[PDB]
Each structure stands twice: as structure tokens, then as C-alpha cells.
């Protein structure tokens, strides 16, 4: 993989962070100085050679609000993925930690960070295909970044009606999921439609049921997340519009 190939001799493992979706993740250093996360691609977990379109995606996409790939160690097994280190870990766990006592301006900033990454992915005509708080990470400064981008159990509770009924994926199904991710942020990590199963959620969504306004979301913030859930996909905003709406609310409320 040319310049993306990292020499595993340059890595030093400092602590196991936990079992990531797809293998063990560890905090470590590159050439003793740079902080990195090291994902060990689990042995025979998914397909490899042909499935390495995910590395082509990680190697061609780059944004300040996307978790950055630094390199790979593929001349060995298990394969290592070296990425930017996100000290506060997964957004969903970060939201659930009641000790942060978040103010609403901090929650809207988390939405803006994700919206910026998504406007960038929209501009490259790329679909995340699993946008949710579980796939976002938080760095030491509280900056949220989107990870596992377009990786590749179906995320029923983040899907619009046309996806659940017809597998109609579009930029608008990522808009819908983003509205659900804003709801996860403003509810401090509640499971969307927490009283329902996936099957009950799909039928209620087809019937026009929508997630309620979380207590911490103002009417203006709620209007932004609710605009992502229009039944007609063409009536949902673009990520550029959502970003301008979020910036307007931050200037007004803050």
C-alpha cells in the first residue's frame, strides 16, 4: 500500500482500550512520540483482499472531523490499522458518562462536528451506511469525529422508510440517520425508540411516528433534527443546509 505501509517496528503498545467492533484496539505510540490507536483486524473475521475497498476509502477520504487513518501493517497477520487516537473513546459512552454534566452549547457543538464530516462525505458522493453515535469517537479536546466510514444487525432505528421498505439508499438516508444521531446526543445516549423492538420501530416509522423532542433540545434544535425525518426524501435538507442551520442556532442560542 505504498506510503501508507507502516513498519510495525515503529509501534509501541501502551494499553488495551477494549474490544472494538471488529477486533482489539490498543493505545500506543509511533516512533516513541506520536499517539495512535492500533486496531488489530480480527483473524478471518470479514473478507480481506477484495474487501480492502475499505482501506481504499480510508486512504482517499480525509477531513478534520473524520477519524484519520495514519497507515496499515499488512505484510503480517493479524493486520494492524493505525489511526488518530481519540482519548475520550466512543461518543455513545461519552454521552452516557453523567460526570461531564454537558451544557446544551456543548451538545450542539457535537452535532456541528458530525455535520461538518457529513457535508464533506456528501461533497464526495459517499454514503456512511451506519451513521450513529456508536461509530463516532471523541478526542481529548471533546471534538467529535465520524469513524468506521462506509464500513461494509441492520441499523433499523437509524434508517428512513424508503431504506427499510425498498433498500433505497441515498444522501437523504444519511440525512435521516444524522437526525437520529442528533437525537442520541440530546437524549445523552438513549437508544432510539427504546420501548420498541426493530420490527415495531419499522412499522411505527412507516406510519409516521417520530422520535420525541429530548428535554435538552430547544424547539429550534428540534426543528433541525425533525427536518431530517420528512417522509419524502427530497424534502429533507442537505448537510450544507443542516450545517448553516446549526451555525445559526449556535449564534442565536449561545
Ligand X SMILES: CN(C)CCCC(=O)N1CCC[C@H]1c1nc(-c2ccc(C(=O)Nc3nccs3)cc2)c2c(N)nccn12
Residue 147's binding partner among ligand ULV, ligand X, none (Cβ under 5 to 8 angstroms by kind) is ligand ULV
Count how many residues are written for the chain: 254
122: left (phi over 0), alpha (psi -120 to 50) or beta: alpha
Strands of 68-141, DSSP E: 69-73, 79-83, 89-90, 136-138
Give yes or no for residue 6 binding ligand ULV (CB under 6 A). Answer: no
- Residue 140, Cα to own-chain centre: how many angstroms? 17
Q: Which residues contact 253 (CB under 8 A, 6 or more apart)?
A: 104, 105, 108, 218, 220, 221
- Mapped onto helix, strand or coil, the DSSP state of residue 228 is coil
User: Which residue of 28, 39, 144, 242 would you call a contact of ligand ULV, by CB under 6 A?
Assistant: 39
Q: Least separation, in Å, of the C-beta of 100 and ligand ULV?
A: 14
Q: Which residues are catalytic?
A: 130
- Residue 31, Cα to own-chain centre: how many angstroms? 29
C-beta of 30 vs 183, nearer to ligand X: 30
C-beta of 58 vs 224, nearer to ligand ULV: 58
By C-alpha distance, which of 157, 132, 8 is closest to 73?
Answer: 8
Q: Least separation, in Å, of the C-beta of 162 and ligand ULV?
A: 26
Residue 83's binding partner among ligand ULV, ligand X, none (Cβ under 5 to 8 angstroms by kind) is ligand ULV
Torsion angle, CA of 67/73/78/82, rounded to 10 degrees?
-20
Taking residues 143 to 182 in sequence order and writing x for each that binds ligand ULV by CB under 6 A, - otherwise, the string is ----xx--x-------------------------------
Q: Which DSSP helix (H) or strand (E) runs through 114?
A: helix 104-123
Residue 62's binding partner among ligand ULV, ligand X, none (Cβ under 5 to 8 angstroms by kind) is ligand X
Region near ligand ULV per CB under 6 A, out of 15-23, 105-113, 176-184, 235-243: 15-23
Q: How far is it, in rounded angstroms, from Cα 249 to Cα 33?
A: 40
Region near ligand ULV per CB under 6 A, out of 4-12, 33-41, 190-198, 242-250: 33-41
- Residues forming the site for ligand X (CB under 6 A): 3-4, 6, 30, 34, 36, 62, 68, 70-71, 82
C-beta of 153 vs 195, nearer to ligand ULV: 153
- Sign (positive or negative) of CA dihedral 191, 195, 201, 205: negative
Helix axes 171-186, 219-227, angle to 10 degrees: 150
Binding residues for ligand ULV, per CB under 6 A? 17-18, 20, 25, 37, 39, 41, 54-55, 58, 67, 81, 83-86, 89-90, 93, 137, 147-148, 151
Known binding residues for ATP: 17-25, 39
Known binding residues: 17-25, 39, 83-86, 151
Known binding residues for dasatinib: 83-86
Amino acid at each position: 500500500y505504498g506510503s501508507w505501509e507502516i513498519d510495525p517496528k515503529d509501534l509501541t503498545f501502551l494499553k488495551e482500550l477494549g474490544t472494538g467492533q471488529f477486533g482489539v484496539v490498543k493505545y500506543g505510540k509511533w516512533r516513541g512520540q506520536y499517539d495512535v490507536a492500533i486496531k488489530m483486524i480480527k483473524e478471518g473475521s470479514m473478507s480481506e483482499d477484495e474487501f480492502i475497498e475499505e482501506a481504499k476509502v480510508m486512504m482517499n477520504l480525509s477531513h478534520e472531523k473524520l477519524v484519520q487513518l495514519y497507515g496499515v501493517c499488512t505484510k503480517q497477520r493479524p493486520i494492524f490499522i493505525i489511526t488518530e487516537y481519540m482519548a475520550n473513546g466512543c461518543l455513545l459512552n461519552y454521552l452516557r458518562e453523567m460526570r461531564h454534566r454537558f451544557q446544551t452549547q456543548q451538545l450542539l457543538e457535537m452535532c456541528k462536528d458530525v455535520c461538518e464530516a457529513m457535508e464533506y462525505l456528501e461533497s464526495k458522493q459517499f454514503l456512511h451506511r451506519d451513521l450513529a453515535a456508536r461509530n463516532c469517537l471523541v478526542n481529548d479536546q471533546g471534538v467529535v469525529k465520524v469513524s468506521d466510514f462506509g464500513l461494509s444487525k441492520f441499523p433499523v432505528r437509524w434508517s428512513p422508510p424508503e431504506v427499510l421498505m425498498y433498500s433505497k439508499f441515498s444522501s437523504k438516508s444519511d440525512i435521516w440517520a444524522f437526525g437520529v444521531l442528533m437525537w442520541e446526543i440530546y437524549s445523552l445516549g438513549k437508544m432510539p425508540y427504546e420501548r420498541f423492538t426493530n420490527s415495531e420501530t419499522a412499522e411505527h416509522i412507516a406510519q409516521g411516528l417520530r422520535l420525541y423532542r429530548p428535554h435538552l433540545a430547544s424547539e429550534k434544535v428540534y426543528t433541525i433534527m425533525y427536518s431530517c425525518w420528512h417522509e419524502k426524501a427530497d424534502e429533507r435538507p442537505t448537510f450544507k443546509i443542516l450545517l448553516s442551520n446549526i451555525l445559526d442556532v449556535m449564534d442565536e442560542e449561545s
